[PDB]
């Protein structure tokens, strides 16, 4: 399976280079922007410069309308780098210009080519502007028309995990990290499979044409690692606005090392099924990390949540 | 990297106490590693609660150096550790 990750925009950009520098495993990273300076600056490997004319390569003035135009120009340049993927992750901080109206355009040339298209996006912080927070909401509904799954992480929901004395530089690195965990938490099930493996087909059958989705994660250690992590994942603040008993599909990733106990897999499984509708498609698998010992990570993606 | 600082703040001949900085985001627990440098010792490691910023590493030899490295296990990231070597 060929998995392409595409950070469109200023926010999206720095997020995927955080995923290039920290490295995501068995995945190909792409930088998309209008501002040509960022492309030279960022260290990703494959930069895509859209809108070279209708922008002059001088950014989208925080203006979504030219965002959609700069990419409604180069759909064939997007398609050129896109052709052949099986799954694409589009990563953008919503609210700007480049990554607000052009991410739905990338979503559609990909979804047109029949790629499995999963958008992973931030809602801006309260302190950022009513206009950003309304720019973001409007880009998320048109993006909602050209994706199989949309994961929205409201950056405000990180204030509940961010200490005070916190610099805004830190506040956006924290959001960089959650965009990454959302992609890594799903990709690794395809690229780093474990003994209870999920095929690409099983991801597709749980993410294809499902609309809105949210995700939570949790890590624990020791005797009770499996029950503490799953609970940390179910009660995550990035999942607390949804009602997991009402999603058409739950996808669960247990990242563990070789010492994962049979009864622990059973435990995570049975606790997820206890909060999920009896009709939801529940896909529970493992991804292997041989560096992990007596710890455990549980990621949960509720898909089609309303 | 998380933590971003990790320095020895107090020392005896047979034990150190390292003190890291406080996270921008909530850590569940820290994974503290130390084993022989190259010598395939089982490393052993140990864990401390996420609320802590120091840790006592005890029963050391005023001699051989080890692989001091603090892992931050956080539900909200998977950032890479911070490290040091020390032979007392
Ligand atoms: N994760 C992340 N999000 C960001 C960053 N900078 C800005 N954002 C978010 O992204 C939104 C749009 O910013 P930006 O990407 O620069 O606009 P664009 O280039 O026109 O898409 C902001 O309202 C922020 O919430 C960043 O460095 N990392």
**Alpha-carbon span B21 to A143, nearest angstrom:** 40
Give me the DSSP letters along A150-210: EEEEEGGGGGGGB-SS--HHHHHHHHHHHHHHHHHHHHHHHHSB-TTPPPHHHHHHHHTT-
Backbone breaks in chain B after residues (C–N over 2.5 Å):
none
Q: Which residue of A181, A220, A295 is in closest CB contact with B77?
A: A181
A179 and A233 share one domain: no
Q: Are strands B29-33 and B46-49 parallel, antiparallel or unpaired?
A: antiparallel
Q: A160, A153, A285, A282: which is closest to A212 by C-alpha?
A: A153
Write out the residue range of the structural domain in which residue B9 sits: 1-88
B74 touches chain A (CB under 8 A): yes
Question: What is the number of other CB atoms lying within 10 angstroms of the CB of residue A292?
Answer: 20
* Same domain flag for A174 and A233: no
Joined tokens for residue A159? 């204030």
Rounded to an integer, what distance in angstroms lies between the CA atom of residue B3 and that of residue A19?
A: 18
Q: Which sign, positive or negative, has the C-alpha torsion A269, A23, A38, A177?
A: positive
Enumerate residues lining ligand 1, CB below 6 A.
Answer: A 9-12, 14-15, 60, 62, 93, 95-100, 122, 124-125, 128, 132, 155, 172, 175-176, 179
Encoded tokens for B81: 């550790």
- Distance in Å, alpha carbon of A300 to nearest chain B alpha carbon: 12
The answer on A94 and A14 residing in a single domain is: yes
Same domain, A215 and A138: no
* Paired strand residues for A217: A299
Beta-bridge partners for A219 = A297
Phi (first) and psi of residue A202, to 5 degrees: -75, -30
Helix (H) or strand (E) holding A112: helix A103-112
User: A140-168: buried (b, 16+ CB within 10 Å) or exposed (e) per residue?
Assistant: bebbeebbbbbbbbbbbbbbebbeeeeee
Which residue bears the tokens 């998380």?
A: B2
Q: Does the CB of A184 have a partner CB in chain B at under 8 Å?
A: yes
Q: Which residues from A are below 8 Å from B51, CB to CB?
A: none
Structural domain count of chain A? 2
Cα separation values, A291 from A86, A288, A294, A295, Å: 28, 9, 10, 10
Largest CA distance in chain A: 60
Same domain, A156 and A234: no
Considering the domain architecture, whether residues A182 and A63 belong to the same structural domain is answered as yes
* Domain limits for position A293: 200-303
Do A182 and A291 share a domain, yes or no? Answer: no
User: CB-based contacts of A245: which residues, under 8 Å, 6+ apart?
Assistant: A275, A276, A277
CA A49 – CA B67 distance, rounded (Å): 44
Resolution of the coordinates, Å: 2.6
Closest chain A residue to the Cα of B26, Cα to Cα = A161
Q: A37 and A153 in one domain?
A: yes
How many domains does one find in chain B?
A: 1
Q: How many CB atoms within 10 Å of residue B60?
A: 18
- Dist CA B16 CA A194 (whole Å): 38
Same domain, A50 and A166: yes
Contacts of B22 in chain A (CB under 8 A): 163
Indicate the burial class of B65 (C-beta count within 10 angstroms; 0-12, 13-18, 19 or more): middle
Looking at A192, A217, A233, the residue that finishes a domain is: A192
Experimental method: X-ray
Best B69, B78, B79 member to test A by mutation, with max A CBs in 10 Å, is B78
Dist. CA B71–CA B79, nearest whole Å: 8
> What is the distance in A from the centroid of ligand 1 to the CA of A171?
12
Q: Is the N-terminal amide bond of B48 cis, ω within 30° of 0? A: no
User: Burial of A285 by CB count in 10 Å (0-12 exposed, 13-18 middle, 19+ buried)?
Assistant: buried
Residues linked to residue A285 through DSSP beta bridges, in sequence order: A253
* Token digits of residue B87: 């032979």
Task: Note whether A109 and A251 are same-domain residues.
Answer: no
How far apart are the two ends of chain B, measured CA to CA in Å?
25
Give the CATH number, domain containing residue A177.
Answer: 3.40.50.1440
Cβ(B82)–Cβ(B2) under 8 Å?
yes
Q: Are residues A142 and A231 in the same domain?
A: no
Are A201 and A116 in contact by the 8 Å Cβ rule? The answer is no
CATH of the domain at A281: 3.30.1330.20
Whether residue A240 is found in the same domain as residue A207: yes
Question: Nearest-CA neighbor of B28 among A54, A221, A81, A65?
Answer: A221
The distance of Cα A9 from the centroid of its chain, to the nearest Å, equals: 15
| Contact in structure between A257 and A289 (CB atoms under 8 Å) | yes
Can you tell me the distance from the alpha carbon of B18 to that of A22, in angstroms, rounded to the nearest whole number?
25
Q: What's the DSSP call for residue A26?
A: T
* Portion 140-159 of A in contact with B at CB < 8 A: 158
Put simply, whether A22 touches B (Cβ < 8 Å) is yes
């Amino acid at each position: 399976a060929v998995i392409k990750v595409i950070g469109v925009g200023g926010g999206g950009g720095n997020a995927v280079e955080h995923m290039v520098r920290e490295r995501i495993e068995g995945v190909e990273f792409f930088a998309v922007n209008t501002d040509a300076q960022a492309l030279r600056k960022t260290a990703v490997g494959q930069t895509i410069q859209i809108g070279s004319g209708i922008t002059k390569g001088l950014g989208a003035g925080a203006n979504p309308e030219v965002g959609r135009n700069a990419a409604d120009e180069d759909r064939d340049a997007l398609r050129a780098a896109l052709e052949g993927a099986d799954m694409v992750f589009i990563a953008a901080g919503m609210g700007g210009g480049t990554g607000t109206g052009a991410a739905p355009v990338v979503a559609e040339v990909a979804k047109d080519l029949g790629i499995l298209t999963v958008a992973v996006v931030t809602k801006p912080f309260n302190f950022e502007g009513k206009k950003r927070m309304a720019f973001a909401e409007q880009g998320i509904t048109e993006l909602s028309k050209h994706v199989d799954s949309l994961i929205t992480i409201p950056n405000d929901k990180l204030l509940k995990v961010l200490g005070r004395g916190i610099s805004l530089l830190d506040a956006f690195g924290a959001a960089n990290d959650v965009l990454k965990g959302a992609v890594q938490g799903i990709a690794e099930l395809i690229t780093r499979p474990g003994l209870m493996n999920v095929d690409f087909a099983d991801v597709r059958t749980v993410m294809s044409e499902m609309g809105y989705a949210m995700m939570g994660s949790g890590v624990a250690s020791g005797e009770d690692r499996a029950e503490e992590a799953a609970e940390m994942a179910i009660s995550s603040p990035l999942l607390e606005d949804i009602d997991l008993s009402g999603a058409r599909g739950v996808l669960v990733n247990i990242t563990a090392g070789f010492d994962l106990r049979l009864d622990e897999f059973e435990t995570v499984g049975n606790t997820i099924r206890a909060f999920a509708s009896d009709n939801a498609t529940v896909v529970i698998g493992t991804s292997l990390d041989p560096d992990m010992n007596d710890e455990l990570r549980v990621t949960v993606v509720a898909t089609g949540i309303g | 990297s998380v933590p971003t600082k990790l320095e020895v703040v107090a020392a005896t001949p047979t034990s150190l106490l390292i003190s890291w900085d406080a996270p921008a985001v909530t850590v569940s627990y820290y994974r503290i590693t130390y084993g022989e440098t190259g010598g395939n010792s089982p490393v052993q490691e140990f864990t401390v609660p996420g609320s802590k910023s120091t840790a006592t590493i005890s029963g050391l030899s005023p001699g051989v150096d080890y692989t001091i490295t603090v892992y931050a296990r956080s539900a909200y990231h998977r950032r890479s550790p911070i490290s040091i070597n020390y032979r007392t």
